[PDB]
Design a protein around this nucleic acid. Structure first.
Ligand SMILES: [Mg+2]
Ligand SMILES: [Mg+2]
Ligand SMILES: [Mg+2]
Ligand SMILES: [Mg+2]
Ligand SMILES: [Mg+2]
Ligand SMILES: [Mg+2]
Ligand SMILES: [Mg+2]
Ligand SMILES: [Mg+2]
Ligand SMILES: [Mg+2]
Ligand SMILES: [Mg+2]
Ligand SMILES: [Mg+2]
Ligand SMILES: [Mg+2]
Ligand SMILES: [Mg+2]
Ligand SMILES: [Mg+2]
Ligand SMILES: [Mg+2]
Ligand SMILES: [Mg+2]
Ligand SMILES: [Mg+2]
Ligand SMILES: [Mg+2]
Ligand SMILES: [Mg+2]
Ligand SMILES: [Mg+2]
Ligand SMILES: [Mg+2]
Ligand SMILES: [Mg+2]
Ligand SMILES: [Mg+2]
Ligand SMILES: [Mg+2]
Ligand SMILES: [Mg+2]
Ligand SMILES: [Mg+2]
Ligand SMILES: [Mg+2]
Ligand SMILES: [Mg+2]
Ligand SMILES: [Mg+2]
Ligand SMILES: [Mg+2]
Ligand SMILES: [Mg+2]
Ligand SMILES: [Mg+2]
Ligand SMILES: [Mg+2]
Lengths: 52, 53, 187, 147, 53, 125
RNA sequence: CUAAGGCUAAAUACCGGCACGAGACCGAUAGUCAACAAGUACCGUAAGGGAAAGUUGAAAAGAACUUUGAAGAGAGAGUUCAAGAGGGCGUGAAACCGUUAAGAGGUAAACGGGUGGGGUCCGCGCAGUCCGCCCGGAGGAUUCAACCCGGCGGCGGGUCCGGCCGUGUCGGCGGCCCGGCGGAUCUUUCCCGCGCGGGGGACCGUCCCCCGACCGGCGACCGGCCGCCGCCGGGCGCAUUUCC
RNA sequence: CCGACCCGUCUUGAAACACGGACCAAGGAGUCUAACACGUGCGCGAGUCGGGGGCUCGCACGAAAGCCGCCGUGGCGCAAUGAAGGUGAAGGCCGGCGCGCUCGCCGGCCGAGGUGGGAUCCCGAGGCCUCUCCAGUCCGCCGAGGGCGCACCACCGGCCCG
RNA sequence: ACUAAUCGAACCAUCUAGUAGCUGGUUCCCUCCGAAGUUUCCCUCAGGAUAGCUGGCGCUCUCGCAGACCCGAGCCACGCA
RNA sequence: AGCCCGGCUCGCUGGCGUGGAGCCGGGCGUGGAAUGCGAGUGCCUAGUGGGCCACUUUUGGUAAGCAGAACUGGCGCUGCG
RNA sequence: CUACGCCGCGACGAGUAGGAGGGCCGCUGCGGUGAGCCUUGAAGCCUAGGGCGCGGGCCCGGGUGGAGCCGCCGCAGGUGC
């Protein structure tokens, strides 16, 4: 049971990865390459009103 | 046997350590239980400060 | 059959960065093109430094950069380091410096920009001076590492001052026999 | 990742990288630091001189807190206050000198490595070295002691 | 997460990471006139081996 | 940027097929359908693609407009050419060459249009 | 500090027990010894040792009936999608065996290289490809070019007009009441605690949105106007054009 | 037709009259933890690290992820040396003075010395140009020499502790 | 001699996966490089440490990178064997 | 890193402006044998540490397919004529 | 012109113990992805069937079978006899 199942990652690196993922989520080529079927979405950084 | 340069190491693993190994898989559960106990105590002493005296 | 020896045929050297950093790979593409299509040996040196590892690209302190750029005849030249610029808190006054670097520490960047300096990435350096004209190519201390204190002749040999590997430093840890004439010998 | 290791490449080779002659046996040479004076003496003398024997006075019940005395050098001395402090002191018309409390910053002794900028400063410390005091007096400062 | 001009106000020590390559447009960098003036002419002729008659 | 996005998706993409010592890319605007920086139909600021028409006659030439790069709904302009083969190839040649809209894809687009038209014409006996 | 008297919850432990939940675990030689009438069968005087063993089918619809045999077992018939699923019955490998077919056989077999013969198969093999231009022949058809209208793109434009963008630069009108966050920077010499604190101010650093201007640019942040080009749709063009 | 001894293993030497192997199926042997060392990749960088705790609908995922900042206590690094008491890392030039006595009192500067190598960079006399010339307009290449010299090496000085 | 087919110290379970410098085994492919049975020390001589022989990772430099086809226009590298 | 000119320092040496060493400038390239080759440098490191054979030299032995050394090559690790 | 790509020229190719690299070699499970495959037939197995690769191995045809399985990008092993 003491296999060392868990890894600790530096907080700065975790924040860095979050920033990279967010930056990539606004590029249509990368989201299309993930295969998310964005062909009729009006704007890839898709923002809706707070009513939702 | 020593091999080239190195640090003289003295592991304290000559005493049947595998019978006494404390794993920490219950650490998140322990944190949850402690938080629940804190909240229950704070509710019990309602206007009194939660941390105590 | 031919009377030759094959043990040194394959030269051991970096032909590419071992890193998977895509920005580093893009600017390696840029400097590969520049080193191929120009006669500037500066581009070749910069490319081979880009290939290098982190221990082979030691950080350059602000104080050392200032000292090297302060030398005569280096006015209005671009300091180029393939690596990280590090703030030195031991220096008080920072002059105006135009520096290109792979990374700059946040505090060092703030100090350089507050002193009226300019900071360039390597693509900007390629645009500003494709042949590397008017540049001072600097390097951090390559042997400024703890491992080099242990490297060398063995500690238990005469006239060797190489640091031994000890788990603790104290009067009980490797100081008696072979370290003083009162216990056997010293060398 | 076990898929990146030599074991995945040593499949099919009988000796598993340990040789056919000398083999891989349990403990040839002893266990741990065995024979450091007999048959590993060359290794011990070559890489760990001083390993054997006693040197010095033993002291029972050592308390590290008693000897706790962190040090700061004069080259890092001005980093203990704000940049505003140093610039205001430098551009001050009057000869007023700022006070630096290294005990407040977490240091007990002021050491003398480096040089100071040419401006007076009062330094509060538990201990001073001789050259640190000399260099502080050189820039027109003062060294004052605390307990 | 902050701007590059502002530190993050909800993380108390965090700022956005920096680019080691400001302009990643390799095509425009290579086709820029100041790069092109510094280059030697391309050697675009293939010199295959000559059969030794 | 195109080069940066290429470094991202050159080996990790849902359109990437690696089989039989070959590689192919199935993104919509890829002439020759090959995994390459030049022919990738997503990473470039301007792209051109040729597809069969909804009905089995003619071709649809789609080009990427300049402005709405982050707006995929209006990023592509599609025209339908249902002329004879020579006229269709002339139209595609003029759209690529006269506009100077990616002149390095001209013969790829012409060959793809020829393939589509040949597939569309009725089979023989 | 006050021994040689005493009690005391919480935070802590938990491979037994009761009841649960889950898993980048194992999948019937694995996982508990034990997926099953398993601490069972069985072994030893005893202490104790200790297995093997899952799967028909959706449903028994589990083969009525006839026939040979004393029967086991067969031949028919029947159920089923299937018994080439028939009560240790999902699939059903290898070793090994029977039979059939082909080939061969006195240096034990077996093997590497090279051919040859035979055989089973494969090739829609069996009159042998295609396709770009042009010439000639014999037929069709919108329509070919150029013009007109409309739409949409690409490129360029002193910024033509905005919207702006980067870097500075001014007066701070602009914020501790009517914009923030920080400073080991100075203070009531206006405010509540002994001449001894907490507030409130000033300054500084980053700011913030602003009133505007000058520098570089329309940039890959976009629009409107023009100019050129391209495409498409609809007209006209109906024949030495164009296309099939 | 030619070639062809049975594999594995220990061995100087195996086809061996050396050992294991009748055949087939399934199982079957460098693993995990801890501690070091070096190399490589990543983040930040004279700092770095929340791993223990706490805060967040307590829980499908989530026993995750996020956050703390007067939670950075603490670890490692930033200072060494001595058994210890303890001590603890800045020099070079121009000067006026004792007596510039191989040294004591200050100023003005600058801020880790010097030699030999040293990638790179800088200057560069003179050359390379067109239909030609007397006459200078702008920049490109080659270039003998010279200069500043990264890292690193060898050496000589200097500073700290015994 | 005998002490339940066991006796120069029974049987059972556990410590226990006891230790072994000794024997046996140690599971896919291709490519590249490629040994040693020697020195010194060891209650060492069937074993280790140590140097040597090996591999891997590099790094610091040297000759230049030539004419877009083409075309050199006393003196010809640091250093090594 | 050579040679040759000057000059400076020394608390060493000393009849002597002596000797020696160091330091600072300057001028000398016909690169001061042949041949070949690109060199320098660091870290980590496995296996090995039973060897055997041949020409020649060689010790013990009557001799040995014996025992022990030196040199080079080989077998071990290597197929092929 | 998948720049981790493509192209050119020259030399070279033995290998135990051992070291390293590559593997679009192979097994199992996890995160993604293939608007993947499948009762109009998955896995497994059999095959004088057609092939590919130096090889590890893989693809396709035919049969049997009767319900699940695989490619690619990463991750992790109780991973190859
Ligand atoms: Mg050869
Ligand atoms: Mg070899
Ligand atoms: Mg091997
Ligand atoms: Mg084997
Ligand atoms: Mg002894
Ligand atoms: Mg079982
Ligand atoms: Mg089974
Ligand atoms: Mg019977
Ligand atoms: Mg069936
Ligand atoms: Mg059956
Ligand atoms: Mg048969
Ligand atoms: Mg054996
Ligand atoms: Mg023998
Ligand atoms: Mg054998
Ligand atoms: Mg024999
Ligand atoms: Mg025998
Ligand atoms: Mg034996
Ligand atoms: Mg036998
Ligand atoms: Mg057997
Ligand atoms: Mg098996
Ligand atoms: Mg958490
Ligand atoms: Mg602390
Ligand atoms: Mg130097
Ligand atoms: Mg020295
Ligand atoms: Mg045992
Ligand atoms: Mg043996
Ligand atoms: Mg041995
Ligand atoms: Mg002999
Ligand atoms: Mg051997
Ligand atoms: Mg050999
Ligand atoms: Mg041979
Ligand atoms: Mg080989
Ligand atoms: Mg296994």
């Amino acid at each position: 049971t003491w296999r060392r199942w868990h890894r600790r990652v530096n907080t700065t690196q975790k924040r860095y990865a979050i920033c990279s993922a967010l930056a990539a989520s606004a590029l249509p080529a990368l989201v299309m390459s993930k295969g998310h079927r964005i062909e009729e979405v009006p704007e890839l950084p898709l923002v809706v009103e707070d009513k939702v | 046997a020593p091999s080239r340069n190195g640090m003289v190491l003295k592991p304290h693993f000559h005493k049947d350590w595998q019978r006494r190994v404390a794993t920490w898989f219950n650490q998140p559960a322990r944190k949850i239980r402690r938080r629940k106990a804190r909240q229950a105590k704070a509710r019990r002493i309602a206007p009194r400060p939660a941390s105590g005296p | 059959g031919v009377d030759i020896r094959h043990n040194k045929d394959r030269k051991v050297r970096r032909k590419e960065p071992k890193s998977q950093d895509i920005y580093l790979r893009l600017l390696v593409k840029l400097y590969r093109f520049l080193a191929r299509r120009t006669n500037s040996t500066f581009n070749q040196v910069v490319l081979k430094r880009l290939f290098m590892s982190r221990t082979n690209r030691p950080p350059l302190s602000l104080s050392r950069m200032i000292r090297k750029m302060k030398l005569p005849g280096r006015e209005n030249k671009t300091a180029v380091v393939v690596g990280t610029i590090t703030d030195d808190v031991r220096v008080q006054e920072v002059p105006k410096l135009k520096v290109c670097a792979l990374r700059v520490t946040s505090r060092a960047r703030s100090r350089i920009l507050r002193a009226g300096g300019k900071i360039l990435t390597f693509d900007q350096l390629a645009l500003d001076s494709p042949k590397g004209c008017g540049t001072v190519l600097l390097s951090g201390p390559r042997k400024g590492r703890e491992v080099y204190r242990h490297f060398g002749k063995a500690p238990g040999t005469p006239h060797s001052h190489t640091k031994p590997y000890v788990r603790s430093k104290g009067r009980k840890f490797e100081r008696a026999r072979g370290r003083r004439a009162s216990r056997g010998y010293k060398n | 990742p076990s898929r990146l290791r030599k074991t995945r490449k040593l499949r099919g080779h009988v000796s598993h990288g340990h040789g056919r002659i000398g083999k891989h046996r349990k403990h040839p040479g002893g266990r741990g630091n065995a024979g450091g004076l007999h048959h590993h003496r060359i290794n011990f003398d070559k890489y760990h001189p001083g390993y054997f024997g006693k040197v010095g006075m033993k002291h029972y019940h050592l308390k590290r807190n008693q000897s706790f005395c962190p040090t700061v050098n004069l080259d890092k001395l001005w980093t203990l206050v704000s940049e505003q402090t140093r610039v205001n002191a430098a551009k001050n018309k009057t000869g007023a000198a700022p006070i630096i409390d290294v005990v407040r910053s977490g240091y007990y002794k002021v050491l003398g490595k480096g040089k100071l900028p040419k401006q007076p400063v009062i330094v509060k410390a538990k201990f001073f070295s001789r050259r640190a005091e000399e260099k502080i007096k050189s820039v027109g400062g003062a060294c004052v002691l605390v307990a | 997460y902050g701007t590059w001009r502002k530190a993050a106000s909800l993380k108390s020590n965090y700022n956005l990471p920096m680019h080691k390559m400001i302009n990643t447009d390799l095509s425009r960098i290579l086709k820029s006139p100041e790069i092109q003036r510094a280059l030697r002419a391309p050697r675009k002729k293939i010199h295959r081996r000559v059969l030794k008659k | 940027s195109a080069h940066l996005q290429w470094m991202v998706v050159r080996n990790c993409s849902s359109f990437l097929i690696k089989r039989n010592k070959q590689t192919y890319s199935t993104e919509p605007n890829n002439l020759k359908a090959r995994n390459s920086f030049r022919y990738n139909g997503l990473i470039h600021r301007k792209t051109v693609g040729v597809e069969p028409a909804a009905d089995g006659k003619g071709v649809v030439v789609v080009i990427k407009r300049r402005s709405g790069q982050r707006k995929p709904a209006t990023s592509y302009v599609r025209t339908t050419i249902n002329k004879n083969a020579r006229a269709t190839l002339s139209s595609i040649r003029h759209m690529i060459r006269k506009n100077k809209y990616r002149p390095d894809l001209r013969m790829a687009a012409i060959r793809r249009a020829s393939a589509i038209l040949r597939s569309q014409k009725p089979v023989m006996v």
